[PDB]
Each structure stands twice: as structure tokens, then as C-alpha cells.
Design a protein around this nucleic acid. Structure first.
Lengths: 270, 49, 49, 78, 40, 67, 198, 209
DNA sequence: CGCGTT
DNA sequence: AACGCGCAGACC
């Protein structure tokens, strides 16, 4: 749930979405070709970019424009990261943001043939140009029910539900998502259980498990008394740790062998 | 039995009826209103039984 | 009878709509709905129709 | 200094009725005038209504203590 | 009305207590800052 | 971003708008009407879905069903 | 497809229910009015966070929830100034009393303050404004039965002094007890348990 | 980065101040909610080798009723804090009568440092917190209800009242984020207050073990 | 396999 | 240079 002014307008929410979603070179790149141009000033390709800027080999990694504009990146920071990631060992010449082709030139200075292949492969498979891991892709849907719209008691007294933008991710992090600015660090749940136990607390886990169980059981319109759900959650969160309902979670309690064998692992517990 | 009091809505009850007139006198014979254990108005269905 | 005529007209309209959706998808006009791909949005529109 | 609930739980009531019916079936002195019935369960129910069953329930608590209640002492539900 | 007035005066006394707490906090910070200075 | 030409700036703005529109999610469909009053916000606007007559609050967002 | 789905559902739900039952087959409410397992480990100080059975509970609405401040004020304040309305509702032997006696006026003002406090508590407790809540006794049905039995006839001036209603509600709240005990902690737990109902 | 580092430092300082206030350590109501303009104006807003350097923004707050009790909040610059740093901190702390401290590490301290931390425990209590966890306050989270660290007197009162052994109460490991937030340790009961939809408010207890 | 300590 | 551990992987 967006907290700042980004919650109302979508312009200042796309940036939050981009910074939360995982972007990599494999996403903002179109083609990659390894060339053996001997002299940098020779330039086997027709590109007037090295002479202005000034090893017998390089990699031309031409980036796409639409994806770069969607993620709102700049070759400056891309090159900064691609240099800081590998140290002061490479010299990645970038291109201005005026030409049509978003070409690059990765060169190494100080087996060498395959080294460029290996390095390009391991930077393309993962680089993290702007985003956090785990989170694959983030959505952007408006809240249609009261379970997500913002609620605020006006001066007159009425609740008056407000329709604010909200992002629906696909991974788990929470620790890194709540820290981002323009993100409500109060209403941003997680949908997972172990994640809430590691992030918030055992009591937050009990509340979250209750909500998820209620949701999955009331999704079909049915109704179950809250007492049964609360009792189940309490039995699961009594011993602090989230005791699993399976054998591995129930047979660990100090109940007794006559009761543990009644369930499972008969001969073992005996 | 007894003096039971309850109100229930019939299945084929138009929602745009309580707002307009004929609230306590439904033309379609809906709005089950039992008083002192005596059916007065409305038809019985799963919503009432 | 008249119910049958209405049902046949509705089915013919639905067929025409799905044929138009197919023609649009072939000629490349149906833009991808946000959050869904081209085939996904085509199937969604056909199913909704 | 008894803290348990003053009402008769359904479990206690059912068990007391069954036990009194069994004691009656084994030829035991009744605690109420019989109007003309012979079913021991019905006699136990009548005895419960009259509040004359000579039984006291020993309700145990989680700690280990126990409170002894009387059918004529605590209030009956049904 | 006099009851409202004495309630107002009690609120004023609470505000004075807030002021005295603030002045004590400042009087202790004026000395605690030296330990933070010598620490570095 | 500020030094680019007018055509380049217009293209960048259009691309950004297209990306923002595609990243969004399709709103849930339904028959919007003001005949049902939502008990969670007291508003009249809402949507109805027949499949079981489910009601989705429009402004307040009250969720309910009628049989 | 439907037949296969039914078969797999019947095959999985069986194991699910078996595990759910073996996890809590021992939990039970003790005579100390607290839920515990076979190891006497407290799972709930009071069953269902209230100490009430799930059978005698029905759905009801919270009247003081999601109101408009002005609507709530004019509906739950009992104006003891409109002598015409006071005569219309109560009787002459009570209008003069509610006008002269100021102790009654102070008591009603204190009652309204308590009503406002409970409304704020509900608002901060039930976010999103959900009036539908499960409670034991259905007070609306009870009031309706009382009317139909005693033949109230809603039209003539009734004979019920507000001080009587206030003292009756207070005595009833004192009677309904869950955590028996004059201890400060006992009283705090009793109040917290029967809060929503009161 | 410069601005981002300053924003993270400011957020961490705010979280530490709120944590200290919840535990009981008297903190200025001003610093308890200061914004970032004053943070800049006080420090410098040039963490990239400038004035706002770590170890200088450390804070020493004293407990409310016990002015003789205080606690430091260090901010080592070493990403992977070692043992020489904590050793020198304890050696410099040994001068004063303080006992409690709190380390805020950039990255996870080496396992060898935790050994010394628990070894120096009975004489000087010190616990570590990652910056990644301090950037957000979990107590203000919707799920996290209200917690209270009770005292031995009222704990014994509760036990004697309920005629229940402390071992029977629910459990909450000390490694719990909220437990570490409150600084509670083994053998201590925390009170939890929850909005129960079937009883307004519901109060429960959990012993740390 | 990597860090840090002895 | 060898040992204390911890994460990841592999294997059962």
C-alpha cells in the first residue's frame, strides 16, 4: 500500500513499482555480440562514439529503448553499477541518450576469449540494475472492496472509504519492501507465514494466519465461527514457534508416546 | 409454537421495495412478518424455514 | 416461442462478436490488456462475451 | 471459597442422571415419592427435579485442587 | 463554570510540569553533550 | 532526460505512459448500480454480479451476497 | 473433470481432517474457565476469547458504529430540555422530575460520555466499519418479545425513568460475570472479556 | 550514495529513539520525532567522507527512574564487525558504571563476535541489531499488537492468582523480533493486548524461554 | 568453501 | 598453517 502522495496519482507510483520489481540486463537488453576489434580507434562497426571518448576485443551489448524507458534507467548508473560490480578491472564505454541505438562496449584491461563469454553470461543472468531479488514482477490494481481501500474517519464521523493505488507482488521479502519509502509500513502484509514469523513476530504470525485461514474458508461464502479459527491458531502458535499440524510439528511437543503413536511414527516414537 | 417473533425476506423479493412505498404491505407477498407466533405476511421458503 | 427467438438472436450476436474479436486479433488491433498478454486478453474477451 | 461456575454442566447432569438410574436399578432407596413409575432413568430425572439426589460432584481444577458441589447446592440448568 | 475554570487551571499546571520536564532535559543534555564530544 | 530534443522527449513521455498503463491491472468487472446500499460505508454506488447475487461496494467497498 | 476433482478432494480432505483432529483431540475447557491441552498448558485464558459457547450466538448489528457524529449526538443524548418532547414521551410526573433534578441531568451527561467512549473504542477496534458482529443475546428480538407480551402500544407516554434504565443496565453489567474475583487483575480481565457485549 | 545514506541513517536514528522510548528510556519529545531537515542541519548531510560519520551520531540515553543506568547505541563503520571493535568498546565503557549497550551493525557480525558478546553478558549486556531491521518499526505494524514487559511483582501476582506455574503459560522465543525490540530475556513474561472481535479487547501472556 | 582467530 | 564455525550443496 502506497503511503506518500504516490497513493493517489499513478505517475509517482510507477516509480515505486519499478524500484520494487526485479530488473536485470536480460530484461533491458536486446542483443549481445562479442567482437575482436584490435585498435579501439579503428572501430570495426560504424559508430562515432569512441573517438569522442578517446585490449584487442570487446562486447557490444545494445540495450532496448522501450524497456529502458519503462524502468526509467540511465546508462550513467548502469555503467556505474557494471563497473562497481566488477571493480576497477573493466572499462565499459556507454552511449549518449540522444542516438537511436543504445549500444555499449564492454572491454577488459589490465582463456581471455571465453572470459568475456563467462562474464557477459553471469552479468546477463543476474545483475540487479534496479530492484530487489525474489520479487519477480509487481502488478498495479486499484482496490475494489473494503478489504483494501483506505479508511479514514472524516471530521464529520463517517468512514468514507478512499480508493488508493496498491501493488500486488509475486515474491517474498517484506523486510526490504517495508523499508522503501512511499510504502505504508503499517498495512503492507505478506501472505506468507514463515516470512511474518521471521520479520514481525509470533503474534503477528497468529493474526496473519487467522486472516489467511478466514479468507480461504470464507472465499466460498461459507461461515465458520471465529472461535474454531482462534482455537486452531492458538494451538499452532502456543509454543512460540509455529508448530506444524503434520507429524513433524505435533510429535515434538512433550505430550507423550501413547498419544504420538496414536497419530503417526508409531514404532519410531515407541 | 409459542409467541415467536421474526421477520424474513422472501427469495423473489425486489430490493427496490423497502425504499419506495408498500414497505409494510408487499404487493408480491414477501417480507415474512410473524408476530405472537402467527404468520401475517409473506411466503415461506428456504430463507424462512 | 418468442423466448426461442430471443435466445437465437443472442447466440447470433455472440457469434458475430467472437468473430469480430478473432478478426481484430488476426489483423493486429486488439492491444494487450494491462497485466495480460495478447492471447490472454483475447481469451478473456472471448470468455466474457 | 469456591470459584467454579454455579451452574450444572450438561455432562455432569447426564452422568449424574445415569449413575442415579443405575443405583436405583440395583435396588436402592429413592429420595422422592413415586407417583407411579418404574423406569429407573425416569425416577432419577424426577429426583433431579426435586433436588434430592444424594450425590456431590468433585470437580477437579487444572492445578490439582478440587471443589465438591452438591446437586441441591448448585443451580441446575435444565 | 468555576469547575471548568479549575479544570483549565489543572491543565495549565500540567503544561507547567511539561515545561519543567523539558527544562530538566535541557539541563542534563547540556552536560551529556560533553561525553559525546570526548567520545569522538 | 532534460537535454533530449522535443521529439525524443515526446517519445520518452509516450513510452513511459504506455509502460505505466500496461503495468496496471484490469479492474474487476461488474454491473454498477445504486440500488443496493453498502453496510460498510453507507454509500449507494456498488456493483452486482449474478452467478448467487454478490454485491461489491463501489465507494466504501462492502462485500455481500444475496440468495 | 468434475468427477476427478471430487475424487481428489475426498482423498485429500480425509488426511487433512485426520491431522486437524489429532492436533487438538485433547484440548478442552477446564472448570477454571480456561482452555488447556493434555499438558495443562493454557491455550486461552477464556474460550473463544470470551468464554462463551458457539451455539447460543447470533448475528447482530452495532447501532453506535459507523454513525455521523451529529446523528449519534441527536440519537443517543436524550435531550432533557425539550419539555414538549419530554411530555410526549414520558409522563407529567417525570418531566418535572427530569427538569428540576440536576442529579439526573448529570447522570445522563455521564452516560452520554460513556456512550461516546464506547463508540470510539468500537471504531478503533473494528476498523473498516463492520456493524455485523456475533453476540450471545439478541437484544432486538428480546425487546420485540417484551413488547408483544406486555402490550406496550408504542404511542402513549410510557412510565420508565431514565435513571431507572441507567441503574438497571449498570446492575445487569455487574451481574454478568466471567472472571469471578474482586482482584484488580480479575476485574480487569472481566471487563476486557465482556467489553463488546456491554 | 550520499542522500540515500543520510535517509537511512535518519530512519535508523528515529527507530532507535522510538525503541528507547518504548523500553522506558526518557528521550526528548523533539528528537523522538524530529524530521530530516534538522537532522541535516545538525550533522551536515555529507556521509560520503564528511561530517555525518558513524560513531559520532551515537547516543547515550538514561533510563527514566534510574538515572544511574544508561545504554549506548554504537554504529560501527566496519561492514563485517570483528572482535577488536567490541573489545575496545567494552574497554572504553569499563571506565563508567554503565552496564547495558546496543550495537547497530551494518552487516551480520562474525560468529566469533557473538561468542564474546554472550560471554561478556553477565557483566555487560549488549545486543546487536541490523540496520535492515531498524529501518522499519514493527510495533507500529497493524499485525503486531500492543506488548508490555511486566515486572516480577505483577508476574508473581498473576501466577498466584491463576494458580498456574510459569512453565504452563504460552512461549515466545527470545529471538523473536518483538522480544529483541523490547530487550527482554529468558525468564520474563510479556503481556499482549489484542482487539478480539468477540470480546472487544483480549489480554494474554507469554513467557520467554 | 570462506572468514577470522590462534 | 590449522582450527572454531556457518552456508550451501550433495547424498542418503
Amino acid at each position: 500500500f502506497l503511503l506518500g502522495q504516490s497513493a493517489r496519482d499513478a505517475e509517482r507510483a510507477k516509480d515505486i513499482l519499478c524500484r520494487l520489481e526485479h530488473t536485470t540486463l536480460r530484461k533491458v537488453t536486446a542483443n549481445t555480440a562479442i567482437y575482436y576489434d584490435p585498435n579501439p580507434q579503428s572501430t570495426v562497426v560504424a559508430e562515432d562514439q569512441e573517438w569522442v571518448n578517446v585490449s584487442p576485443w570487446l562486447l557490444r551489448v545494445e540495450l532496448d529503448r522501450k524497456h529502458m524507458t519503462d524502468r526509467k534507467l540511465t546508462m550513467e548508473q548502469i555503467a556505474e553499477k557494471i563497473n562497481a560490480g566488477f571493480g576497477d578491472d573493466l572499462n565499459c564505454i556507454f552511449n549518449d541518450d540522444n542516438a537511436e541505438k543504445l549500444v555499449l562496449r564492454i572491454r577488459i584491461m589490465n582463456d581471455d576469449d571465453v572470459f568475456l563469454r563467462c562474464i557477459e553470461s553471469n552479468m546477463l543472468t543476474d545483475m540487479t540494475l534496479q530492484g530487489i531479488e525474489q520479487i519477480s514482477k509487481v502488478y498495479m490494481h486499484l482496490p475494489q472492496t473494503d478489504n483494501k481501500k483506505k479508511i479514514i474517519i472524516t471530521e464529520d464521523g463517517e468512514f468514507k472509504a478512499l480508493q488508493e493505488w496498491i501493488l500486488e507482488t509475486d515474491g517474498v521479502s517484506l523486510m526490504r519492501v517495508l523499508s522503501e519509502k512511499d510504502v505504508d509500513p503499517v498495512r503492507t502484509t505478506s501472505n506468507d507465514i514463515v516470512e511474518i514469523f521471521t520479520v514481525l513476530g509470533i503474534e503477528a504470525v497468529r493474526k496473519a494466519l487467522e486472516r489467511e485461514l478466514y479468507h480461504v474458508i470464507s472465499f466460498d461464502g461459507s461461515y465458520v465461527n471465529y472461535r474454531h479459527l482462534a482455537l486452531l491458531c492458538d494451538t499452532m502458535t502456543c509454543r512460540g514457534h509455529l508448530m506444524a499440524i503434520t507429524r513433524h510439528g505435533v510429535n515434538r511437543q512433550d505430550t507423550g508416546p501413547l498419544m504420538k503413536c496414536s497419530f503417526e511414527e508409531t514404532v519410531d516414537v515407541l | 409454537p409459542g409467541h415467536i417473533n421474526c421477520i424474513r425476506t422472501h427469495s423473489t423479493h425486489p430490493d427496490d421495495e423497502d425504499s419506495g412505498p408498500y414497505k409494510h404491505i408487499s404487493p408480491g407477498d414477501t417480507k415474512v412478518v410473524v408476530e405472537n407466533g402467527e404468520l401475517i405476511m409473506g411466503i415461506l421458503c428456504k430463507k424462512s424455514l | 416461442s418468442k423466448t426461442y427467438q430471443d435466445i437465437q438472436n443472442t447466440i447470433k450476436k455472440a457469434k458475430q462478436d467472437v468473430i469480430e474479436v478473432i478478426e481484430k486479433a488476426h489483423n493486429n488491433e486488439l492491444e494487450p490488456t494491462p497485466g495480460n498478454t495478447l492471447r490472454q486478453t483475447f481469451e478473456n474477451q472471448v470468455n466474457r462475451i | 471459597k469456591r470459584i467454579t461456575t454455579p451452574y450444572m454442566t450438561k455432562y455432569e447432569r447426564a452422568r449424574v442422571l445415569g449413575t442415579r438410574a443405575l443405583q436405583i436399578a440395583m435396588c436402592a432407596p429413592v429420595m422422592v415419592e413415586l407417583e407411579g413409575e418404574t423406569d429407573p432413568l425416569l425416577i432419577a430425572m424426577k429426583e433431579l427435579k426435586a433436588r434430592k439426589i444424594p450425590i456431590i460432584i468433585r470437580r477437579y481444577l487444572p492445578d490439582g485442587s478440587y471443589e465438591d458441589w452438591g446437586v441441591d447446592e448448585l443451580i441446575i440448568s435444565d | 463554570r468555576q469547575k471548568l475554570l479549575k479544570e483549565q487551571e489543572e491543565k495549565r499546571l500540567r503544561e507547567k510540569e511539561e515545561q519543567k520536564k523539558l527544562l530538566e532535559q535541557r539541563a542534563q543534555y547540556v552536560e551529556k553533550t560533553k561525553n559525546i564530544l570526548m567520545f569522538t | 532526460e532534460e537535454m533530449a530534443s522535443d521529439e525524443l522527449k515526446e517519445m520518452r513521455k509516450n513510452l513511459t505512459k504506455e509502460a505505466i498503463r500496461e503495468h496496471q491491472m484490469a479492474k474487476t468487472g461488474g454491473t454498477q448500480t445504486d440500488l443496493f446500499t453498502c453496510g460498510k460505508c453507507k454509500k449507494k454506488n456498488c456493483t452486482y454480479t449474478q452467478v448467487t447475487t454478490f454485491v461489491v461496494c463501489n465507494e466504501c467497498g462492502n462485500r455481500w451476497k444475496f440468495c | 473433470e468434475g468427477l476427478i476433482d471430487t475424487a481428489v478432494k475426498t482423498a485429500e480432505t480425509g488426511y487433512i481432517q485426520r491431522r486437524l483432529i489429532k492436533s487438538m483431540e485433547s484440548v478442552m475447557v477446564k472448570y477454571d474457565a480456561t482452555v488447556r491441552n493434555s499438558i495443562n498448558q493454557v491455550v486461552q485464558l477464556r474460550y473463544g476469547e470470551d468464554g462463551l459457547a458457539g451455539e447460543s450466538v447470533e448475528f447482530q448489528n452495532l447501532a453506535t458504529l459507523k454513525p455521523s457524529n451529529k446523528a449519534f449526538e441527536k440519537k443517543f443524548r436524550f435531550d432533557y430540555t425539550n419539555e414538549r418532547a419530554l411530555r410526549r414521551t414520558l409522563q407529567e410526573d417525570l418531566v418535572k422530575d427530569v427538569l428540576s433534578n440536576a442529579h439526573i441531568q448529570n447522570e445522563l451527561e455521564r452516560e452520554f460520555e460513556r456512550m461516546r467512549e464506547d463508540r470510539e473504542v468500537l471504531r478503533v477496534i473494528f476498523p473498516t466499519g463492520d456493524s455485523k458482529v456475533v453476540l450471545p443475546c439478541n437484544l432486538l428480538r428480546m425487546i420485540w418479545n417484551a413488547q408483544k407480551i406486555f402490550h406496550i402500544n408504542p404511542r402513549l407516554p410510557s412510565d420508565l425513568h431514565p435513571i431507572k434504565v441507567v441503574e438497571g443496565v449498570k446492575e445487569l453489567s455487574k451481574k454478568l460475570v466471567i472472571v469471578n474475583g474482586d482482584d484488580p487483575l480479575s476485574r480487569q480481565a472481566q471487563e476486557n472479556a465482556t467489553l463488546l457485549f456491554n | 550514495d550520499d542522500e540515500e545514506e543520510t535517509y537511512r541513517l535518519w530512519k535508523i536514528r528515529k527507530t532507535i529513539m522510538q525503541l528507547c522510548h518504548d523500553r522506558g528510556y526518557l528521550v526528548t519529545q523533539d528528537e523522538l520525532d524530529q524530521t530530516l531537515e534538522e537532522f541535516k542541519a545538525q550533522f551536515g548531510d555529507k556521509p560520503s567522507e564528511g561530517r555525518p560519520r558513524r560513531t559520532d551520531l551515537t547516543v547515550l540515553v538514561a533510563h527514566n527512574d534510574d538515572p544511574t543506568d544508561q545504554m549506548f547505541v554504537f554504529f560501527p563503520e566496519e561492514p563485517k564487525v570483528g572482535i577488536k571493535t567490541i573489545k575496545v568498546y567494552c574497554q572504553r565503557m569499563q571506565e563508567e558504571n554503565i552496564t547495558r549497550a546496543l550495537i547497530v551493525v551494518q552487516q551480520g557480525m562474525t560468529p566469533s563476535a557473538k561468542q564474546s558478546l554472550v560471554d561478556m553478558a553477565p557483566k555487560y549486556i549488549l545486543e546487536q541489531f541490523l540496520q535492515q531491521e531498524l529501518l522499519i518499526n514493527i510495533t507500529e505494524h497493524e499485525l503486531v499488537p500492543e506488548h508490555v514487559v511486566m515486572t516480577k511483582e505483577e508476574v508473581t501476582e498473576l501466577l498466584a492468582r491463576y494458580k498456574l506455574r510459569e512453565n504452563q503459560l504460552p512461549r515466545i522465543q527470545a529471538g523473536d523480533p518483538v522480544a529483541r525490540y523490547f530487550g527482554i530475556k529468558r525468564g520474563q513474561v510479556v503481556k499482549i493486548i489484542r482487539p478480539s472481535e468477540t470480546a472487544g479487547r483480549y489480554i494474554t501472556y507469554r513467557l520467554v524461554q
